[PDB]
Design a protein around this motif. Structure first.
Motif, PDB file in Angstrom:
ATOM      1  N   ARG A   4      39.005  43.402  31.641  1.00  0.00           N
ATOM      2  CA  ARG A   4      38.849  44.681  32.326  1.00  0.00           C
ATOM      3  C   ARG A   4      40.040  44.975  33.221  1.00  0.00           C
ATOM      4  N   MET A   5      40.577  43.944  33.867  1.00  0.00           N
ATOM      5  CA  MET A   5      41.746  44.114  34.717  1.00  0.00           C
ATOM      6  C   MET A   5      42.970  44.527  33.913  1.00  0.00           C
ATOM      7  N   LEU A  44      23.355  52.280  43.238  1.00  0.00           N
ATOM      8  CA  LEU A  44      22.908  51.268  42.297  1.00  0.00           C
ATOM      9  C   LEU A  44      23.354  49.878  42.718  1.00  0.00           C
ATOM     10  N   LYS A  85      33.192  26.879  43.201  1.00  0.00           N
ATOM     11  CA  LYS A  85      33.865  27.983  42.534  1.00  0.00           C
ATOM     12  C   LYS A  85      34.128  29.129  43.496  1.00  0.00           C
ATOM     13  N   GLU A 122      23.492  45.011  28.878  1.00  0.00           N
ATOM     14  CA  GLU A 122      24.011  44.149  29.922  1.00  0.00           C
ATOM     15  C   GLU A 122      22.913  43.780  30.903  1.00  0.00           C
ATOM     16  N   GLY A 123      23.082  42.651  31.561  1.00  0.00           N
ATOM     17  CA  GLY A 123      22.117  42.276  32.564  1.00  0.00           C
ATOM     18  C   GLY A 123      21.079  41.320  32.045  1.00  0.00           C
ATOM     19  N   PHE A 152      38.142  30.544  45.622  1.00  0.00           N
ATOM     20  CA  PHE A 152      38.581  31.912  45.863  1.00  0.00           C
ATOM     21  C   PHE A 152      38.557  32.256  47.344  1.00  0.00           C
ATOM     22  N   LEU A 177      42.529  34.896  36.713  1.00  0.00           N
ATOM     23  CA  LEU A 177      41.136  35.038  36.295  1.00  0.00           C
ATOM     24  C   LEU A 177      40.895  34.396  34.938  1.00  0.00           C
ATOM     25  N   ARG A 205      30.758  38.488  43.190  1.00  0.00           N
ATOM     26  CA  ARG A 205      29.750  38.012  42.254  1.00  0.00           C
ATOM     27  C   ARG A 205      29.471  36.528  42.427  1.00  0.00           C
ATOM     28  N   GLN A 214      41.754  33.384  49.738  1.00  0.00           N
ATOM     29  CA  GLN A 214      41.728  34.561  50.603  1.00  0.00           C
ATOM     30  C   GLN A 214      41.981  34.188  52.055  1.00  0.00           C
ATOM     31  N   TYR A 224      23.873  41.546  37.224  1.00  0.00           N
ATOM     32  CA  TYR A 224      24.982  41.387  36.300  1.00  0.00           C
ATOM     33  C   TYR A 224      25.104  42.529  35.311  1.00  0.00           C
ATOM     34  N   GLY A 225      24.164  43.461  35.299  1.00  0.00           N
ATOM     35  CA  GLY A 225      24.265  44.575  34.387  1.00  0.00           C
ATOM     36  C   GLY A 225      25.023  45.747  34.913  1.00  0.00           C
ATOM     37  N   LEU A 226      25.351  45.724  36.195  1.00  0.00           N
ATOM     38  CA  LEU A 226      26.092  46.798  36.827  1.00  0.00           C
ATOM     39  C   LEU A 226      27.580  46.621  36.585  1.00  0.00           C
ATOM     40  N   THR A 256      46.853  35.381  44.937  1.00  0.00           N
ATOM     41  CA  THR A 256      46.324  36.021  46.136  1.00  0.00           C
ATOM     42  C   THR A 256      47.445  36.441  47.077  1.00  0.00           C
ATOM     43  N   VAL A 292      35.184  39.376  41.605  1.00  0.00           N
ATOM     44  CA  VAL A 292      34.715  38.094  41.095  1.00  0.00           C
ATOM     45  C   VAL A 292      34.211  37.226  42.236  1.00  0.00           C
ATOM     46  N   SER A 310      36.326  39.721  33.187  1.00  0.00           N
ATOM     47  CA  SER A 310      37.031  40.272  34.337  1.00  0.00           C
ATOM     48  C   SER A 310      38.514  40.422  34.048  1.00  0.00           C
ATOM     49  N   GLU A 346      25.919  34.953  43.567  1.00  0.00           N
ATOM     50  CA  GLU A 346      25.382  33.906  42.715  1.00  0.00           C
ATOM     51  C   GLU A 346      25.181  32.591  43.448  1.00  0.00           C
ATOM     52  N   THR A 382      20.973  49.839  32.558  1.00  0.00           N
ATOM     53  CA  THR A 382      21.996  48.924  32.054  1.00  0.00           C
ATOM     54  C   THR A 382      21.483  48.430  30.714  1.00  0.00           C
ATOM     55  N   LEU A 416      45.872  30.315  41.836  1.00  0.00           N
ATOM     56  CA  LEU A 416      45.004  31.162  42.645  1.00  0.00           C
ATOM     57  C   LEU A 416      45.664  31.526  43.968  1.00  0.00           C
ATOM     58  N   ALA A 451      37.369  45.567  38.143  1.00  0.00           N
ATOM     59  CA  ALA A 451      37.600  44.135  38.207  1.00  0.00           C
ATOM     60  C   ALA A 451      38.782  43.798  39.099  1.00  0.00           C
ATOM     61  N   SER A 452      38.674  42.653  39.768  1.00  0.00           N
ATOM     62  CA  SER A 452      39.710  42.093  40.623  1.00  0.00           C
ATOM     63  C   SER A 452      39.235  40.715  41.048  1.00  0.00           C
ATOM     64  N   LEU A 453      40.109  39.987  41.744  1.00  0.00           N
ATOM     65  CA  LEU A 453      39.704  38.698  42.292  1.00  0.00           C
ATOM     66  C   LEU A 453      38.631  38.864  43.355  1.00  0.00           C
TER      67      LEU A 453
END
Ligand SMILES: Nc1ncnc2c1ncn2[C@@H]1O[C@H](COP(=O)(O)OP(=O)(O)OP(O)(O)=S)[C@@H](O)[C@H]1O
Ligand SMILES: [Mg+2]
Lengths: 319, 608, 448
Positions: A254-255, B406, B443, C352-353, B447, A243, B434, B451, B420-422, A215, B431, A251, B438, C349, A211, B426-428
């Motif tokens: 998708r990346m 949205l 966790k 999803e969701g 990250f 990831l 999110r 950073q 979570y439906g949107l 980064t 995540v 994720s 959450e 959505t 990680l 993607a990237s670190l």
């Protein structure tokens, strides 16, 4: 917490323990903040990782972190390669004199030997004169990776962190480099060394170090596009690997698909073949069941065999 | 007679020169005797008869102020008024109840303990919390009444963990549906709005309302308008429906932007619209009332807009064109003085979505009342803090097509899983976003630490924000010493939460702050730096009062709202244990904690 | 002793048993004779006796002239009707389709008795006319009932309703499913004889097909009708898979979902709208996972009801379970119903969701209770009268060791080999696949 709240005197020791713990993870900023609230190894390891080159280092100390720190500090505060060589040689001499002193347990002994290895790699890259020597240094790093995959984790992590510091400092200090070594060369070799360390750290299942590395690599992309380097695909693939190894499957997928959609894998230093990218996406989509096994073969596997372009030998085709 | 008796007895008791006072006292005695002897067949049930008896009798003997002690006359009267407020067939009405409450709650007396309180059980508080919140939404209430209301709301939340539903609604459609009831038309809505002015106005306002009703009912009786007749016969009671009929006798720029910011936009626009339709007798009698009475235009705006648009449906559609051309400028209006009129525009659009268009096949044609750009309306409703309304508008927009708004909708709407439906690239970093939404533990610490290190090493300016995030994360775990060390290296909630957890009672707390952590911290600090229980009770009561005043301030999302309710619950438990006098009371407090645990096992984790 | 302490929970079983099958009938007859002898239950057993006799007589009475499908007949014009009304006035009982909770205090006086019957009864379309009675209780509530006659098997439906209720009760023991109130809506099936029963008419619902077929032509007047889509799909039933899939794509290109309007025209307030749409998505997710785990089939539009007061779905007619549905002539090869209209009601959505997260929470809680589900199915294994195959009678009524195999399939659907994410991904892939939906039976309206 329970000792701070109860005004207990053990909290001091607790803080000590915490700092130790926070250095065995890689969280250097947290241990820095815990130190500024008031060890020696922790102080100088954190200063080297965050690149704080203005600490007054004690003289005649038996700590490996202080030795390595003084070498890198001298590398920061110097305009001539001869001063840096003198500081490195003084470090090597003092470390050997300390190893000869006798009563050391095995952890301290291996820490001192790793300090010797770090100072030797520093001395090696300080003495490169052209491009062929740079490529030979990189190949040396790869062979040592062959040994490192199975070795003890403390030694490997120590050597690899010091190597990261060496490569970044060399890329920053433009007057310490030889004539025909531009900044694009130094940047490219730093990127390659980091990707090598990320492979090694991945085999050891060290999540926080991968990680940290990904980064720190992603932060180099802005200052790599101004030097004329195309290294976004390999760095974004390293981020996707981080990831995936933390459990974020969608994720990561998708990346990788974004890498495959908008990126030119041909005009790219640190190359990346389109067939290994496609087969990586296919494998990860199969593991996550994200698509039906009839679209996986149509979108990722047969395109990969077609990207091979008749070549039926090597490790790419094997994969 | 219930409301008249209550108001009259209250004003007399306040009024109680020598001969006039003796006459007033003799009238008071005669009136109380009459009310004690009163009995009517028109009482809906016997519950209403006992409510009438209790209200009248307790009002006959109150003092000048009100209290909450168990067994006095003022507290029995307050409890009767509150219990009557929450019902379907209620005795009192809004003006009489407002008079009584402004007499009782104007200068209050909150009991020190809670064993001597008129509401002392968790069940009484759960039952009466909604009405007590409905009550403490005025401006004529003392500080001790707001402290008492905070104690009741805090006990209700600590016993149920549920928010009163008045605090969770974001549109006015419930009031528009309460008014336009019986038939469901805008004429009934306007008739109810005008009728409520007869019993609640001064001389001038009641006179305007009676004049309007006389004109309307007479011109509906003569011209034999059956729709308007059916509206009147169901909006007005019979005595007012008869006193409005001249049976023998005879009856004696806004449409442009930057006009959304003056506090009289609604009144001017309502007059301008109502003047354009003289043939409707209900809109013709309006401009007087709209100009004179205060706050009437905002309550009547949707009904006026609908009546005009429905009138000129087949004729030349002028108001539709003007309003639909102005909405393109009014909905894209980011301003603080314009937010309260933008809310009214959004509520008018919503109300028009519920009215059937004549000659329609489906509800998808109710999009033809006006011509609204639903993406602009969604953005506007996101600016005003109406996130369910914003989501509905976003879905209507998406239908019109067949994502930056949205994200702001789904970050703030009150559902665990919708975010979570949107879909987002993607990237670190994403995540990490999110994981911090959450409220993950280690966790997100991983990250964020990565950073933060990378930004300290590169001398980046984002590290500051990183540190902020980290502190937030380290408080969602319980690691208070680490967040303390991260704060000393240079938020408000984090600072005072950490100070309370580590018990650092020497921070200088700001005054007049909207943070729950500061309120709770000041109460516990006062508990540390004090030698008398009375100082601590005063600090707790000031905390309850300020928290209720902040809940009444309006624009709060749901997380801040539940944080404030939890602050009320914390202050109430503090006040409960400060007031124990023996061992039996200690064991009763422990048993209360156990029952609340029964509720807590399934409740939301932040509140618990 | 069970029938004496809790009579409304045992005496209908005794009545059905009395009125190795000969030995069972004899034993239940002895228990019935003994029940009509003791002082605690002596005014309750005769009431249930007479009332069940008249309910069964009313169920069996089919007259095509006197009972026209779709009408609304006052129940006094048949002799059966008047005998029924008289007997029901003389004998007061709770409504047979009312769900009574078990009382630890053994006091069943607070239970509403049948006060009277509404004068009329509706009739549905069929051969043996199912009649919909209404009963006004003592507390003044209306309990509607299907009085179902014919040669059906309601004991399958009742057993499976009980099994589903038990598993949904298991769902309440976990933090994530209990926080979201994930569960199923129940109803009450009461088999009277091997040919008749009383089914609880769920209060204020509407069948999914009865909403969707008018709405499709109300909102898209240029699209195909529902009958035209059904006929075009049924004509290409004896053709190769390529032609079937081509016809299915052609038909769904002229048929657009309209389910999102169900919520815009029953709940115009955005707060209520959002809450009811969330209820719909959550109950659909729970029943989808639970019906995958138990092989639930026959999930066409007439077995799914939309509650237009709370927004949630109710699944009825739960008798084709344990994968009995992929043995039919035109098999049902989908794990659950996830057509384009079911997904349209879930919002912007689509899957999803809320839907995917609630599927994952449900499945995760289910495979952490595999021992309790094994216990429930084992209790089912010692039931002599439960059939583990689908008899050709109902198999012809549907499309115009067996215990060991079924329980082993259930046990391997609850195995922790794959993750919950991957399992749910595969399920939602095969439930929405055009190559799986194109080869489904035409009465299973997949185009919808
Ligand atoms: N318990 C119930 N509560 C409410 N509605 C029901 C109930 N049972 C059935 N219905 C509905 O009432 C109607 C009666 O249908 P039924 O005669 O029971 O069987 P059917 O499904 O309509 O016909 P087929 O041939 O079995 S597809 C249908 O529209 C059902 O959806
Ligand atoms: Mg059916």
């Amino acid at each position: 917490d329970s000792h701070l709240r109860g005004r207990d005197l053990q909290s001091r020791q607790d803080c000590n323990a915490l700092i130790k713990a926070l250095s065995s993870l890689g969280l250097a900023g947290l241990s820095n903040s815990l130190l500024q609230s008031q060890s020696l190894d922790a102080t100088f390891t954190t200063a080297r990782k965050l690149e704080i080159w203005n600490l007054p280092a004690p003289v005649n100390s038996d700590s490996w972190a202080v030795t390595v720190y003084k070498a890198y500090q001298s590398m920061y505060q110097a305009q001539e390669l001869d001063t840096v060589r003198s500081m490195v040689h003084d470090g090597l001499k003092n470390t050997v004199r300390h190893l000869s002193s006798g009563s050391l347990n095995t952890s301290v002994l291996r820490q001192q030997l790793g300090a010797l290895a770090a100072l030797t790699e520093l001395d090696d890259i300080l003495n490169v004169r052209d491009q062929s020597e740079l490529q030979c240094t990189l190949a040396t790093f790869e062979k040592r990776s062959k040994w490192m995959m199975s070795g003890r984790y403390a030694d490997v992590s120590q050597i690899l962190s010091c190597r990261e510091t060496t490569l970044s400092m060399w890329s920053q200090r433009h007057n310490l480099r030889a004539a025909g070594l531009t900044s694009a060369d130094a940047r490219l070799v730093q990127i390659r060394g980091m990707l090598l360390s990320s492979d090694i750290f991945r085999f050891h299942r060290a999540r926080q170090e991968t990680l940290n590395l990904s980064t720190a690599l992603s932060d180099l992309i802005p200052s790599c596009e101004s030097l004329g380097l195309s290294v976004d695909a390999a760095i974004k693939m390293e981020a996707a690997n981080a990831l995936w190894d933390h459990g974020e499957m969608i994720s990561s997928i998708r990346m990788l698909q974004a890498i495959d959609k908008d990126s030119s894998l041909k005009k790219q230093s640190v190359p990346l073949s389109r067939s290994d990218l496609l087969s990586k996406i296919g494998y990860q989509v199969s593991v996550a069941r994200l698509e039906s096994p009839d679209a996986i073969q149509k979108k990722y596997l047969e395109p990969a065999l077609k990207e091979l372009k008749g070549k039926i030998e090597g490790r790419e085709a094997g994969q | 007679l219930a409301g008249y008796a209550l108001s009259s007895l209250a004003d007399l008791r306040v009024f109680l020169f020598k001969a006039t006072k003796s006459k007033a006292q003799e009238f008071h005695a005669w009136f109380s005797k009459y009310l004690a002897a009163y009995d009517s067949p028109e009482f809906k049930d016997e519950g209403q008869k006992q409510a009438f008896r209790s209200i009248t009798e307790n009002a006959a003997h109150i003092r000048a102020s009100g209290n909450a002690e168990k067994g006095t006359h003022e507290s029995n009267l307050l409890l009767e008024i509150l219990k009557d407020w929450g019902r379907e067939n209620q005795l009192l009405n809004e003006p009489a109840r407002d008079v009584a409450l402004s007499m009782l709650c104007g200068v209050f007396n909150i009991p020190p303990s809670s064993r001597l309180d008129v509401i002392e059980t968790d069940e009484d508080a759960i039952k009466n919390g909604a009405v007590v919140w409905k009550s403490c939404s005025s401006q004529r209430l003392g500080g001790e009444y707001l402290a008492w209301a905070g104690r009741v709301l805090g006990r209700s939340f600590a016993a149920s963990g549920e928010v009163p539903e008045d605090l969770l609604r974001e549109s006015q459609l419930q009031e528009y549906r309460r008014l336009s009831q019986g038939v469901g038309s805008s004429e009934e809505g306007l008739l109810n709005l005008i009728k409520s002015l007869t019993i609640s106005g001064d001389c001038f306002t009641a006179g305007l309302a009676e004049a309007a009703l006389r004109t309307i009912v007479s011109d509906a009786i003569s011209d034999n308008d059956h729709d308007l007749l059916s509206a009147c016969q169901e909006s007005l009671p019979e005595p007012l429906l008869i006193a409005s009929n001249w049976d023998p006798y005879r009856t004696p720029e806004v449409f442009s932007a930057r006009a959304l910011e003056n506090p009289n936009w609604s009144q001017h626009l309502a007059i301008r619209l109502a003047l354009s339709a003289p043939k409707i007798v209900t809109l013709r009698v309006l401009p007087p009332i709209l100009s004179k009475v205060k706050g009437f235009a905002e309550r009547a705006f949707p009904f006026v807009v609908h009546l005009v648009l429905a009138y000129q449906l087949d004729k030349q559609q002028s108001a539709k064109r003007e309003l639909s051309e102005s909405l393109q400028e009014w909905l894209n209006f980011t301003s603080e003085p314009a937010k309260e009129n933008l809310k009214l525009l959004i509520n008018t659009i919503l109300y028009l979505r519920t009215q059937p268009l004549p000659g329609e096949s489906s509800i998808a044609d109710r999009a033809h009342w006006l011509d609204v750009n639903m993406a602009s309306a969604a953005a506007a409703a996101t600016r005003c803090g109406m996130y369910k309304v914003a989501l509905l508008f976003a879905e209507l927009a998406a239908e019109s097509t067949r994502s930056d708004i949205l994200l702001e909708i789904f970050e703030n709407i009150d559902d665990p899983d919708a975010y979570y439906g949107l879909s987002q690239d993607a990237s670190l970093s994403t995540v990490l976003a999110r994981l911090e939404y959450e409220n993950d533990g280690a966790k997100s610490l991983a990250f964020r630490g990565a950073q933060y290190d990378s930004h300290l090493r590169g001398r980046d300016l984002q590290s500051r924000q990183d540190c902020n995030a980290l502190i937030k994360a380290l408080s969602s775990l319980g690691l208070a010493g680490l967040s303390n060390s991260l704060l000393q290296s240079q938020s408000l909630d984090a600072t005072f939460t950490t100070a309370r957890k580590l018990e650092i009672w020497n921070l200088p707390a700001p005054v007049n702050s909207d943070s729950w952590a500061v309120t709770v911290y000041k109460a516990y600090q006062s508990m540390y730096q004090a030698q008398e229980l009375d100082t601590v009770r005063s600090m707790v009561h000031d905390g309850l009062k300020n928290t209720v005043r902040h809940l009444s301030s309006g624009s709060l999302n749901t997380s801040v709202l539940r944080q404030q309710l939890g602050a009320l619950a914390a202050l109430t438990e503090l006040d409960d244990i400060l007031n124990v006098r023996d061992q039996s009371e200690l064991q009763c407090t422990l048993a209360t904690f156990e029952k609340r645990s029964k509720w807590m096992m399934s409740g939301r984790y932040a509140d618990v | 002793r069970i029938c004496v302490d809790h009579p409304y929970h045992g005496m209908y079983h005794i009545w059905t048993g009395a009125r190795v099958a000969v030995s069972r009938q004899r034993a239940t007859d002895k228990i019935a004779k003994a029940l009509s002898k003791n002082n605690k239950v002596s005014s309750i057993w005769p009431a249930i006796d007479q009332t069940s006799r008249v309910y069964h007589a009313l169920a069996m009475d089919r007259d095509p002239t006197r009972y026209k499908s779709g009408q609304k007949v006052p129940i006094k014009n048949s002799p059966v009707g008047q005998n029924f009304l008289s007997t029901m006035s003389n004998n007061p009982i709770p409504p047979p389709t009312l769900q009574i909770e078990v009382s630890a205090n053994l006091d069943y006086s607070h239970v509403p008795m049948i006060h009277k019957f509404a004068p009329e009864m509706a009739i549905a379309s069929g051969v043996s006319a199912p009649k919909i009675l209404t009963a006004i209780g003592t507390d003044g509530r209306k309990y509607k009932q299907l009085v179902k006659g014919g040669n059906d098997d309601l004991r399958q439906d009742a057993i499976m309703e009980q099994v589903f209720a038990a598993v949904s009760e298991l769902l309440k023991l976990h933090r994530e499913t209990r926080q979201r109130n994930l569960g199923i809506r129940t109803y009450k099936v009461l088999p009277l004889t091997s040919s008749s029963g009383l089914i609880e008419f769920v209060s204020n619902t509407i069948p999914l097909h009865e909403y969707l077929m008018p709405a499709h032509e109300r909102y898209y007047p240029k699209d195909l009708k529902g009958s035209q889509c059904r006929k075009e799909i049924a004509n290409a039933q004896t053709k190769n898979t390529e032609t079937r899939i081509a016809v299915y794509r052609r038909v769904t290109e002229r048929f657009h979902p309209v389910m999102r309007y169900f919520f815009m025209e029953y709940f115009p307030d955005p707060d209520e709208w959002f809450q009811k749409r969330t209820n719909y998505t959550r109950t659909t997710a729970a029943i989808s996972m639970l019906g995958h785990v138990l092989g639930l089939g026959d999930r066409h539009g007439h077995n799914i009801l939309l509650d237009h007061k709370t927004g949630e779905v109710v699944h009825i007619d739960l008798g084709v379970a344990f994968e009995m549905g992929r043995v039919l002539p035109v098999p049902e090869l989908v794990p659950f119903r996830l057509t384009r209209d079911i997904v349209d009601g879930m919002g912007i959505t689509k899957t999803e969701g809320v839907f995917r997260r609630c599927c994952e929470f449900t499945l995760d809680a289910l495979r952490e209770e595999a021992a309790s589900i094994q216990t429930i199915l084992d209790s089912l294994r010692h039931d002599t009268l439960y059939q583990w195959s689908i008899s050709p009678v109902r198999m012809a009524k549907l499309q115009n060791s067996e215990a060991d195999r079924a329980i082993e399939v259930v046990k391997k659907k609850l195995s922790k080999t794959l993750s919950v994410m991957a399992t749910v991904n595969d399920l939602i892939n095969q439930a929405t696949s055009v190559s799986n939906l194109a080869v489904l039976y035409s009465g299973w309206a997949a185009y919808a």
